[PDB]
Design a protein around this ligand. Structure first.
Ligand SMILES: *CCC(=O)Nc1cccc(-c2ncnc3[nH]ccc23)c1
Length: 280
């Protein structure tokens, strides 16, 4: 079941490109008659090949309604799985779903999305997994009221005696989703995933509008390099403003996810009942 034959994997479209690899829309068509199920296939480098096998084993060990379903692999020279096969969600990434259907998604609908992302993250933390690229662009839409965490290319497992990990090479994702410890020291933990969540929370309560986006807004508040400016601003006490018509209660939780000390930050298991008291 988990061994999908590449010959039966028929190319449809490019789903995306991010963090060295690419995701393609394929049809797993063993009958060769265009009736088979659609699946999302990821493919990629020496440390890149160790990082693909890392992504595969992590996702394969993840079993949640709020994490993209792993379907299996399409093997190659090894021991070395040529490609990773995931479930396909035709609604796609939450960022463009938000933009496409905003006139229809209200506060209640956004809190349910928040609480679902939250339980997914609480689960990932339980597996000792730190996502490191939690953004609305990396959240998928299963149905109108069901979202899932995706893109585990930069995900890492935490050692049993360690609750944080330091990355050698700099960040390549948009800088605005990182915590001040990730920016200044490349330190990552479930606490740096919590900072990122409050940014996802900001994203939901803007419907990912490009004009007031995390990138567009720092651009206004900001010779000094653009990374050191955000470091300067965040350490001083500056934060993204309350999104247009955002409830005062949702915004306060955003600023707590944005506590400057990472130990002070609320956990995901702590975030959930608070998002669940605001209903849906
Ligand atoms: C909306 C922009 C974006 O990031 N789209 C994106 C990139 C890569 C893959 C997907 C994708 N779409 C649908 N089902 C998927 N399953 C796994 C990954 C999927 C979307």
């Amino acid at each position: 079941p988990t061994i999908f034959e590449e010959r039966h994997l028929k190319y449809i479209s490019q789903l995306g490109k991010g963090n060295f690899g690419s995701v393609e829309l394929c049809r797993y068509d063993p009958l060769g008659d265009n009736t088979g199920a659609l699946v999302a296939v990821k493919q990629l480098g020496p440390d890149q090949q160790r990082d693909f096998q890392r992504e595969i084993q992590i996702l394969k060990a993840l079993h949640s309604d709020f994490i993209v379903k792993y379907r299996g692999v399409s093997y190659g020279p090894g021991r070395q799985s040529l490609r990773l096969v995931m479930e396909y969600l035709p609604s796609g990434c939450l960022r463009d779903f938000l933009q496409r259907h905003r006139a229809r998604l209200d506060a209640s609908r956004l809190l349910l999305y928040s609480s679902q992302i939250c339980k997914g993250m609480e689960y990932l933390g339980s597996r000792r997994c730190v996502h490191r690229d939690l953004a609305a662009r990396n959240i998928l839409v299963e149905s109108e009221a069901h979202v899932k965490i995706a893109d585990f290319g930069l995900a890492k497992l935490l050692p049993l005696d360690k609750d944080y990990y330091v990355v050698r090479e700099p960040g390549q994702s948009p800088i605005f989703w990182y915590a001040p410890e990730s920016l200044s020291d490349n330190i990552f933990s479930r606490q740096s995933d919590v900072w990122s969540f409050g940014v996802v929370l900001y994203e939901l309560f803007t419907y990912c509008d490009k004009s007031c986006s995390p990138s567009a807004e720092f651009l206004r508040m900001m010779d000094v390099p653009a990374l050191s400016r955000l470091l300067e601003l965040l350490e001083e006490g500056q934060r993204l403003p309350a999104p247009p018509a955002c409830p005062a209660e949702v915004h306060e939780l955003m600023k707590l996810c944005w506590a400057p000390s990472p130990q002070d930050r609320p956990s995901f298991s702590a975030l959930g009942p608070q998002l669940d008291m605001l209903w849906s």
